Amino acid sequence: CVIAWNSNKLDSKVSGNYNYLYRLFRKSNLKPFERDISTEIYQAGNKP
Amino acid sequence: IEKSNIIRGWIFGTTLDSKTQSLLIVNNATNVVIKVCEFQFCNDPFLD
């Protein structure tokens, strides 16, 4: 089962919150039920 | 094929370093400890 609900009054601040982060770049697609917490920069070129 | 319990445990992971995840299974004569953490290794892993 998947449950979703609203938390506007619990996760909204006038100055803005930045505690919640997501990931945008990765080399390969993710296996089901897998967790990765790496921090290495995305190698788009040759020089590290 | 063993006598006197020389073989102790096992390590599983990707690169076996302080960077990414690692599983340790140790059997130090008292209980079967399974521990999955972010763990550091040396080049000569041994136990007394």
Binding site: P32, E34 | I1, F12, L23, I34
Partner: protein
Amino acid sequence: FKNIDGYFKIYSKHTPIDLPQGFSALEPLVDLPIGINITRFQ
């Protein structure tokens, strides 16, 4: 040792005695929800 769908499974057996010629089975003993990427072991 097997690892599928984010689950780690361990079967084991012990017996008294090159490997001997005989037949025996193994019983399930560990299942864990580890869910990581495993490639090399020690």
